[PDB]
Design a protein around this ligand. Structure first.
Ligand SMILES: Nc1nc2c(c(=O)[nH]1)N[C@@H](/C(S)=C(/S)[C@H](O)COP(=O)(O)OP(=O)(O)OC[C@H]1O[C@@H](n3cnc4c(=O)[nH]c(N)nc43)[C@H](O)[C@@H]1O)C=N2
Ligand code: SF4
Ligand code: SF4
Ligand code: SF4
Ligand code: F3S
Ligand SMILES: [Mo+6]
Lengths: 509, 211, 1244
């Protein structure tokens, strides 16, 4: 029993408008450098589709995530320590840039400098950002399948259509599409960390953010394969890997991540989750993969339980963090309401970025239809997105937790309409799914009204604890190059000293 | 000739060694971000699996090499012969890719061309010495080279004397090989220092405390 | 030493966890500073985007290293009520990418000029010391003029200087104004709401010098003529927050998540409140993903669905089981109880004009404007002239209100709806039916061109001794819908399954939507509205409004909402969202933008007629007015080319003109003095005699075409310009891709109001000047490109229809390189013009034509019919049967001093708009203190307008929306007309004064204003028409109520007196070119739709690498799988789309969500990125508008008739475009035409 905290995220897919604003803001801030111009820490994909990189969900091809051996032990699908080391000279599963897309730019300047007397109107053609050569044609992009862009038989190759008779969805009337925005899951049992030979990747103790140490990373590029979500991108220029860093510079003072605060749909929720690190391996190694979801909920801890409080304090969790955990929207949606679900819990990484499945227009039927248990509003059975699809995406194939979430959402709707339109109390739909009026009114507060202070409840990472914030506050930022940053030993070959440190020791004790 | 002899085998080996060691330490302490393998696999996968493995498995087998002395020569001529052939094939393939694969050539640095070219040359020379050591199956050639090497690493003056009357080809091989050490800290070769041994016994999950 | 740390190997190994599965390390983490210092910045500056998206989102501009590096949304908007979600963060993907422009490879840094033009300019100046005479030597030489016009869009741009371009612009303006007339100089800039002062910069300059200011709302086809028709209001809608007060919403032809991104959450969140949502789109659009039900009617047939739904509603909630709420509502707020006179036809009657008080004996006791007051029957059988009719607006006071009172005795009355049960007899009235016409691409339902219905009527004794039959609009409406009422009408429905005029079964054939779906939703919608008292709403957009028959689609939806009493209630109504048209502080911005502070009036022009005429698209017209006529109209009383109707509209004072007259309007006064009469009379006499003619009659004589065009905040030649190839050929004089032949070549009928010539005049524009920050397509075809500041480098203001907040644009840093704000660019042009004009123009006198204005007393022009003075049907009375003839004095040498100072007219005359006026002296005094005043010069003592801030402050201080003080005087003025007090609407905010610097600190909510019809309150959200319904303020329509019946002669004769289904018109643009230039691959005809894209806002951001990387990397076209497979097209193949108007090239996006029969090239991807050469024109591939062409509609030219009277962007012809059809095919040769030898060839 060791309590640790992390700011988790929940994305309400039902409210996602597929706008990509989250992707653009992340790109401008973190990945506009040559070498990672093709990398999209945050990217949104339209489903059905294979995604970015192409078919990333196909773990048989890419070898990402963990597997549970016969003996019950966990091992990266890539292979054990030695097997992995044996692939170091040439990672045989490594995705090529073409699996992402060849980054390109256009010769805009030709519009400006075209010579006098051109035979035709000038134009700006494409050019590779990798070779600088002229590109005859752009054949791919990071969001190439946007809004069902491509023949159905191509998009339906979607790993999530497994075990589903998809023929019926090729019919115009049964058409359907949803959006899947995604970043790094900042897992509790990250495969990346376990597949990096140099130990360059680590999970921060105080807030659970998983980072790739840019100093220590050696560019063995095995981690990229290890991540079953393909969220680690090789910086082709620096020779090192980079990944979503959960905007820690901001989270550290209590701010939302850029993609969270910039979400136009107001679908992202940030809230603390307390977990028992000592239960991680036990939970990620449960025999049946359909139990990983529940096994993980069991690893999370109740923030109002004084037993957990005292254990947290004893284990170093700051008071303000405990406080935040007790009013965490992520906890209300994952633990209480059961609306949020993990993404591919079967990879056994214990993902910390969860999702609320989306509703959808009712399916095609013989006639206008009949009033169901929810009146003019839809019953969960009438939704057009095949529920089995959502299950392959969020619950290892188990449709039960997905139906419960979808039903409760619809239930909430039924109750609120009774109230605001008929001016009457009607808890029939709520009772049917097991929610009380109070839970429903609260769900409505966080999901519908969604005040800024309720969507983001990020506590401080407290950079002052176990460190020396004073001399840092006085000297951080003066990057003259003292060459003493990064090590604990004060000795350095250039005979220098740290700018943000006090070297004249007090003689008065 | 005698002057060049003392320079290349009495002095130079210490210049290259001083530059190799202090250069590695200085680049490690002040160039962490520049310390990487510089993989280029993602930009072009074709043939990298075969090429890279041939080269690495080849060159590494040679170094594991670098029971009387003449037995060792035999083993080194056939074992080192094969590894050197695998290595030379891999190297040549890696160089052809670096120079002519648009994506690799466009994003390469000069040092990558230089260091890989010198290694292919160094491997070709190595193979060319085989027929020369074949005229001294008693291991007499190998003995001289070993004598020199041991004198150099124990800081014993006169090292070049051990090389008295050895096939000229062995001279070049030694010069080029020391030159590689000299250019080591300023090329991608620094990845060699980082061979991930500790990984075989490391706990899977890593967590860094507040620091 | 990082090396020495490696020795503390195990000393950094703390506790393990998870039974040896994990290890806690105590090692250095300083490296983390790496990303920390990237996030860090110098400051954040507040700014927004000056682009037409309706977003109006305030952003945080980050400056790091003294440069703009990125941006993130501001979340500090004043919060909405506790029971409503707030607006933060807003924003969208396009907006998030703006930062890219600032230093990108496509940024315009210096003023540019076409090389050929510069060479002749500098050589001319060496021979002509005076720049005016220098331009003259160039422009009057056919070969010189041609050498640079033919160079347009053909490279050769060279770096110039502000001094050089400013002189040439001014010299050219002076020469043009002097030798042809001020109205030969013009400028195009749209949506002032997105950047108020930026728009005003050029409009103010042009207005001072007399140049024409081209419109945009109608030109873009965002103006729904149906609105002016029904409410006498350009456009007024509820805010997005109000969607959250609705319990039933239909998103019809509105792609909310994609085209209203920042407001979408209100739509997704309201669903959790119990609200049901329905999406109506032909394709499975993004908006469907958010709804409960998806209806997919055949594109263009929507009016049919609306009609059938209205049918069910009337049948179930008005007849079978009358709704108390609905009945009372239509009784008091519509023209249903109004009486319509029946005209005698052969064997049957036809609905004529509405009965007026003047028609009766005692004129119903109406002495003032009796012929402009509608008549109805009270429930006691007595006839009455109810309050509110537009007749009570002018010439009297206190009666222009919606109080259900007798217009004569001021007593309370109760209008009756149906005559059924008190008629003197039953008369058969014929209604027009077009549901049987149409192309082969849409289903039709054969009935009769004229449907006879049994209507209850009453015989009345008219004031002229004659007699006539009348019936109510209500009765007429139920008949038109096909509702059986007991008179046993064979053309009425016996059931919803009966295929009759507008039944669910009928619409099922026309639209393809299951009749039971139409019934269920019509029933639910109406039921919800009855239960909540109108809280049902319909979000509608360009999906329906860009069709040629937009009025039918709209009146279909409007009737549904009215029949259910939703208009005017928070949570319900007509939610029209297209462009960012709502510039809230209106009356504060107009005087600035059109120099109304110095001179009145300006020269406004409706752009569709303007371009239709000058880019000569009429010369290729395929649609005849005759084939649009009502089958019951006198075919011979409506002869001529569609353009002939425009010319008649112009000379009758209905629509504006540009150029106005065929003679320089600055010389008329000088001729009137010689003749011995004042200028006005001399003009009327000359017009009658024909010595002076309207320019519209001879657009090609060499003196009636615009010669100088300024373009800013517009990409006209790559986005809005329908008939792209026509513009390139006639306005620019460059190569073009037009494929068809003109009227002359086909030997068709030449217009009867306009001269004809086999060889049309080309290259009419002498100088095209474009202002922009990126080299757009328009810039590429310009003569001079002026580098303008991006939205992060200048100050201005922004407002939108979506929310009630007014916030600013701010300079994060000074404009990069040599860029300048639009305000400063025009300020400098004005300054140079002022000196260059000396000796050429002084204190001139200008005769200006001004069409009869809506909201002005003159709106009461022609009451019962149409009289053309040129036909001798009436005298030429300017301001009534012709346009006003105004005298405007211009002080050309003082243009600059006037531009940079607030004129004396605000003080001498006052300010106002929308039919009301007020004193604004105190505001001017305040402005003198805020902007400082002129030390000397012509404007001595007047407030200054030196900076963009001064200008912004002028707008804020003058408008009632931003100055509570002005707000009360404005409501006080309106109270005179209605007789009801409205000051209570702004009294509790009378001290409020929004300052520019305050909004930089935090966006501010505006004050309720009479300029609009909703309230800015803290208990009720802003809902359009709320004031009419709750304050009893009339709708500026003939009847005062929401008009279902349009009785204007033209509306009746064109079959639109009542709404009716009209099938997409045939542009006949395909069958003439299909197959004429085979490339070997199959060709097929498809409907060419252009909804707005996801990877740009029009063409803006289209060249932005972020948008191009997130999209398909350049111009693309969506095609259904079936259509693509039929044509041999694979996903991403190069394809060519073309028709008579031109050709474009792009790559295909094959998809299942696109229904067979239609193709979609999302709006504005323009002509500068990734386009190969056309296999059809041998030229660079064209753009989406290379295949469209303007085709005006007669019903949109109606003027001098109450609600149908002119207004800048209030009425006028529209640029519809969705009826277009095109030929599609896979390309063969992919030649880039650039000498790169990098061409390709697509197989099979
Ligand atoms: N991202 C982005 N946002 C913008 C703009 C932009 O360029 N990009 N521009 C502004 C401006 S200026 C305008 S005028 C509007 O956005 C137009 O959007 P709207 O959604 O009304 O039109 P649109 O023409 O796109 O039509 C919307 C959808 O309706 C479907 N549709 C198309 N034709 C029809 C039809 O005939 N009937 C019906 N029922 N639906 C039809 C279609 O799915 C389309 O996307 C607005 N914001
Ligand atoms: S999602 Fe993030 S933490 Fe999880 S395995 Fe991938 S990169 Fe590692
Ligand atoms: S910003 Fe929000 S609504 Fe838009 S795509 Fe990203 S997650 Fe979805
Ligand atoms: S472009 Fe318009 S909608 Fe998008 S962020 Fe900017 S202002 Fe908002
Ligand atoms: S495997 Fe490790 S060495 Fe770097 S490239 Fe991945 S973090
Ligand atoms: Mo628009």
């Amino acid at each position: 029993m060791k309590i640790r905290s992390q700011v988790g995220m929940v994305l309400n897919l039902d409210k996602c408008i597929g706008c990509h604003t989250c992707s653009v803001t992340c790109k401008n801030v973190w990945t506009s450098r040559e070498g990672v111009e093709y990398a999209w820490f945050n990217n949104v994909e339209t489903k059905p589709g294979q995604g970015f990189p192409t078919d990333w969900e196909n773990q048989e091809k890419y070898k990402g995530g963990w597997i549970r051996k016969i003996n019950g032990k966990l091992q990266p699908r890539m292979g054990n320590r030695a097997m992995l080391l044996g692939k170091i000279f040439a990672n045989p599963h490594l995705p090529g840039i073409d699996d992402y897309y060849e980054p390109f730019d256009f010769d805009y300047q030709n519009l400006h400098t075209a010579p006098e007397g051109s035979k035709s109107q000038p134009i700006a053609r494409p050019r590779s950002l990798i070779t600088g050569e002229r590109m005859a044609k752009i054949e791919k992009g990071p969001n190439w399948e946007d809004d069902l862009g491509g023949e159905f038989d191509k998009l339906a190759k979607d790993k999530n259509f497994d075990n589903i008779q998809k023929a019926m969805y090729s019919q115009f009337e049964n058409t359907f599409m949803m959006y899947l925005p995604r970043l790094c899951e900042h897992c509790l049992n990250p495969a990346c960390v376990a597949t990096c030979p140099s130990g360059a990747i680590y999970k921060r103790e105080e807030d659970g953010i998983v980072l790739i140490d840019q100093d220590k990373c050696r560019g063995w590029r095995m981690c990229i394969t290890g991540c079953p979500y393909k969220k680690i991108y090789f910086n082709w220029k620096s020779g090192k890997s980079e990944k979503c860093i959960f905007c820690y510079p901001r989270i550290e003072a209590g701010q939302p991540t850029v993609c969270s605060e910039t979400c136009v749909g107001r679908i992202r929720y940030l809230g603390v989750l307390l977990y028992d690190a000592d239960a991680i391996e036990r939970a990620a190694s449960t025999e049946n993969e359909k139990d990983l979801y529940q096994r993980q909920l069991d690893v999370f801890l109740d923030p109002n339980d004084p037993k957990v409080i005292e254990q947290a304090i004893k284990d170093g969790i700051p008071l303000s963090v405990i406080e935040a955990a007790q009013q965490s929207p992520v906890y209300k949606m994952a633990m209480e309401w059961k609306l949020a679900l993990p993404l591919h819990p079967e990879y056994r990484t214990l993902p910390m970025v969860w999702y609320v499945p989306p509703l959808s227009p009712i399916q095609s039927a013989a006639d206008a239809g009949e009033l169901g248990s929810n009146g003019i509003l839809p019953d969960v059975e009438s939704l057009r997105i095949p529920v089995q699809y959502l299950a392959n995406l969020l619950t290892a194939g188990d449709t039960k937790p997905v139906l419960r979430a979808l039903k409760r959402m619809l239930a909430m709707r039924h109750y609120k309409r009774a109230e605001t339109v008929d001016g009457k109390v009607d808890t029939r739909a709520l009772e049917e799914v097991g929610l009380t009026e109070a839970q429903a009114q609260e769900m409505y507060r966080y999901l519908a009204i969604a005040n800024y202070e309720d969507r983001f409840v990020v506590p401080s990472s407290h950079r002052e604890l176990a460190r020396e914030a004073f001399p840092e506050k006085n000297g951080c930022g003066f990057t003259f190059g003292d060459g003493c940053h990064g090590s604990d030993t004060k000795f350095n070959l250039f005979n220098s000293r740290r700018i943000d440190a006090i070297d004249v020791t007090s003689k008065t004790e | 000739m005698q002057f060049l002899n003392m320079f290349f085998f009495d002095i130079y080996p210490y210049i290259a060694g001083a530059v190799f060691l202090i250069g590695s330490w200085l680049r490690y302490d002040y160039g962490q971000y520049t310390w990487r393998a510089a993989s280029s696999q993602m930009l072009d996968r074709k043939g990298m699996n075969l090429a890279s493995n041939l080269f690495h498995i080849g060159i590494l087998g040679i170094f594991v090499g670098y029971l009387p002395i003449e037995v060792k020569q035999k083993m080194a001529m056939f074992a080192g012969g094969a590894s050197g052939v695998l290595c030379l094939i891999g190297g040549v393939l890696l160089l052809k890719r670096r120079l002519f694969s648009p994506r690799v050539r466009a994003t390469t640095t000069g040092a990558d061309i230089l260091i890989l070219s010198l290694l292919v040359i160094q491997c070709a020379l190595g193979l060319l010495t085989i027929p020369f050591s074949a005229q001294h199956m008693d291991g007499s050639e190998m003995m001289k080279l070993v004598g020199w090497a041991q004198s150099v690493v124990t800081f014993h003056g006169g090292a070049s004397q051990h090389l008295d009357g050895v096939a000229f080809i062995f001279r070049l091989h030694l010069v080029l090989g020391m030159t590689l050490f000299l250019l080591f800290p300023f090329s991608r070769l620094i990845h060699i220092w980082s061979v991930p041994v500790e990984y075989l016994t490391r706990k899977y999950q890593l967590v860094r405390a507040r620091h | 030493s990082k090396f020495l740390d490696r020795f503390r190997y195990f000393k950094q190994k703390g506790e393990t966890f998870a039974d040896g599965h994990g290890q806690l390390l105590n090692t250095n983490r300083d490296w983390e500073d790496g990303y920390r210092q990237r996030w860090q910045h110098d400051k954040i500056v507040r700014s927004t985007h000056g682009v037409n998206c309706t977003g109006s989102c305030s952003w945080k501009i980050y400056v790091k290293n003294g440069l703009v590096t990125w941006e993130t949304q501001q979340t500090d908007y004043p919060r909405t009520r506790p029971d409503l979600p707030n607006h933060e963060p807003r924003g969208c993907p396009r907006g998030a990418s703006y930062s890219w422009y600032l230093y990108s490879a496509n940024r315009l840094k210096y003023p540019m000029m076409r090389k050929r033009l510069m060479k002749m300019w500098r050589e001319a100046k060496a021979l002509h010391s005076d720049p005016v005479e220098a331009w003259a030597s160039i422009i009057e030489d056919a070969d010189k003029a041609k050498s640079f016009k033919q160079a347009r869009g053909r490279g050769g741009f060279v770096r110039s200087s502000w001094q050089e371009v400013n002189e040439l612009i001014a010299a050219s303006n002076v020469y043009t104004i002097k030798n042809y007339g001020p109205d030969r100089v013009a400028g195009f800039s749209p949506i002032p709401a997105m950047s108020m002062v930026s728009y005003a910069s050029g409009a103010r300059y042009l207005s001072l010098i007399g140049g024409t200011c081209l419109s945009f709302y109608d030109w873009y086809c965002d103006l729904p003529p149906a609105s002016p028709q029904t409410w006498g209001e350009q456009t007024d809608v509820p805010e997005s927050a109000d969607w959250y007060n609705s319990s039933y919403i239909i998103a019809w032809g509105s792609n909310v998540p994609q085209t209203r991104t920042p407001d979408a959450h209100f739509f997704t969140e309201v669903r959790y409140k119990g609200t049901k949502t329905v999406a109506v789109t032909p394709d499975y659009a993004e908006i469907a993903k958010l709804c409960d039900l998806w209806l997919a009617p055949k594109q263009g047939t929507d009016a049919a669905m609306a009609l059938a739904m209205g049918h069910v509603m009337l049948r179930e909630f008005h007849l079978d089981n009358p709704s108390q709420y609905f009945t009372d509502y239509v009784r008091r707020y519509t023209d249903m109880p109004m009486l319509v006179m029946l005209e005698e036809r052969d064997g049957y009657y036809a609905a004529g004009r509405m009965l007026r008080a003047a028609d009766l004996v005692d004129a119903l006791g109406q002495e003032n404007n009796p012929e402009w007051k509608t008549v109805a029957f009270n429930t006691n059988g007595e006839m009455v002239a109810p309050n509110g009719s537009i007749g009570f607006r002018w010439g009297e006071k206190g009666k222009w209100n919606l109080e259900q009172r007798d217009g004569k005795t001021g007593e309370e009355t109760e209008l009756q709806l149906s005559l059924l049960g008190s008629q003197d007899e039953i008369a058969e009235v014929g209604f027009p039916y077009f549901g049987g016409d149409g192309t082969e691409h849409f289903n039709k339902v054969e009935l009769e061109n004229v449907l006879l219905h049994k209507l209850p009527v009453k015989r009345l004794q008219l004031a002229d001794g004659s007699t006539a039959l009348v019936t109510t609009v209500y009765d007429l409406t139920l008949a038109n819908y096909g509702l059986e009422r007991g008179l046993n009408d064979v053309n009425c429905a016996t059931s919803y399954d009966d295929v009759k005029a507008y039944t669910p079964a009928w619409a099922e054939q026309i639209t393809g939507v299951s009749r039971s779906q139409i019934i269920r939703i019509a029933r639910e919608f109406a039921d919800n509205a009855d239960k909540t008292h109108g809280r049902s709403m319909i979000i509608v957009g360009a999906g329906l409004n860009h069709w040629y028959h937009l009025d039918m689609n709209y009146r279909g939806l409007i009737n549904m909402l009215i029949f259910c009493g939703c208009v005017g209630q928070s949570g319900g109504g007509w939610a029209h969202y297209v462009g960012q048209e709502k510039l809230r502080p209106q009356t504060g911005w107009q005087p600035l933008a059109f120099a109304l502070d110095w001179q009145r009036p300006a020269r406004h022009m409706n752009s569709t007629s303007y371009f239709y005429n000058h880019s000569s698209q009429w010369r290729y017209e395929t649609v005849t007015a005759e084939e649009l006529l009502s089958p019951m109209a006198d075919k011979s009383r409506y002869t001529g080319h569609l353009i002939d109707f425009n010319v008649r509209a112009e000379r009758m004072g209905w629509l504006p003109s540009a150029p106005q007259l065929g003679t320089n309007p600055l010389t008329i006064a000088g001729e009137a003095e010689k003749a011995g009469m004042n200028p006005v009379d001399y003009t009327v006499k000359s017009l009658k005699e024909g010595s002076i003619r309207f320019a519209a009659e001879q657009p090609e004589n060499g003196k009636n075409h615009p010669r100088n065009l300024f373009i800013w905040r517009s990409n006209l030649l790559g986005s809005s310009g329908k008939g792209h190839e026509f513009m390139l050929k006639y306005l620019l004089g460059t190569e073009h891709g037009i494929q068809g032949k003109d009227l002359g070549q086909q030997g068709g009928v030449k217009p009867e109001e306009v001269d004809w010539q086999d060889n049309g005049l080309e290259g009419k524009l002498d100088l095209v000047v474009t202002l922009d920050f990126r080299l757009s397509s328009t810039c590429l075809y310009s003569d001079i490109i002026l580098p303008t500041a991006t939205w992060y480098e200048k100050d201005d203001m922004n407002t939108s229809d979506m929310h009630p907040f007014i916030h600013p644009l701010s300079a994060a840093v000074d404009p990069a390189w040599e860029a300048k704000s639009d305000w400063e660019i025009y300020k400098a042009i004005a300054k140079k013009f002022s000196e260059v004009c000396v000796g050429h123009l002084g204190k001139e006198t200008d005769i200006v034509t001004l069409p009869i204005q809506h909201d002005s007393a003159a709106e009461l022009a022609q009451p019962l019919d149409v009289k053309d003075w040129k036909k001798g049907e009436c005298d030429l009375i300017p301001g009534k049967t012709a346009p006003h003839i105004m005298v405007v004095e211009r002080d050309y040498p003082a243009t600059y001093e006037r531009f940079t100072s607030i004129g004396p007219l605000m003080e001498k005359i006052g300010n106002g708009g929308k039919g009301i006026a007020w004193n604004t002296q105190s505001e001017m005094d305040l402005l003198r203190k805020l902007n400082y005043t002129k030390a000397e010069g012509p404007a001595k003592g007047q407030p200054m307008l030196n900076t963009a801030i001064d200008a912004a402050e002028m707008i804020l201080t003058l408008a009632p929306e931003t100055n509570g003080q002005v707000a009360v005087k404005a409501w006080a003025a309106l109270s005179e007309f209605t007789g009801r007090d409205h000051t209570h609407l702004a009294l509790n905010k009378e001290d409020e004064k929004i300052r520019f610097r305050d909004i930089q600190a935090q966006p501010r909510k505006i004050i309720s204003s009479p300029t609009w019809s909703g309230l800015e309150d803290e208990h009720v959200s802003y809902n359009a028409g709320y004031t009419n319904v709750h304050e009893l303020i009339p709708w500026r329509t003939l009847s005062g109520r929401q008009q279902l019946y349009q009785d204007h002669q033209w509306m009746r004769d064109f079959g639109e007196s009542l709404l009716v289904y009209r099938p997409p018109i045939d542009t006949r643009s395909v069958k003439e070119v299909i197959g004429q230039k085979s490339n070997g691959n199959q060709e097929k005809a498809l409907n060419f739709l252009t909804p707005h894209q996801k990877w740009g806002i029009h063409s803006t951001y289209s060249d932005n690498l972020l948008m191009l990387t997130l999209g398909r990397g350049g111009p693309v076209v969506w095609l259904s799988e079936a259509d693509a497979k039929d044509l041999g097209i694979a996903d991403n193949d190069w394809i060519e789309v073309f028709n008579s108007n031109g050709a474009l090239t792009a790559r295909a996006v094959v998809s299942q969500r696109v229904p067979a029969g239609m193709t979609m090239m999302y709006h504005a991807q323009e002509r500068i990125v990734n386009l190969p050469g056309s296999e059809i024109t041998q030229q660079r591939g064209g753009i989406h508008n290379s295949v469209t062409r303007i085709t005006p509609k007669p019903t949109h030219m109606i003027g001098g008739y109450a609600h149908l009277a002119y207004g800048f962007n209030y009425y006028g012809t529209v640029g519809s475009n969705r009826d277009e059809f095109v030929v599609v095919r896979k390309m063969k040769n992919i030649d880039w035409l650039d000498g790169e030898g990098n061409d390709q060839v697509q197989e099979s």
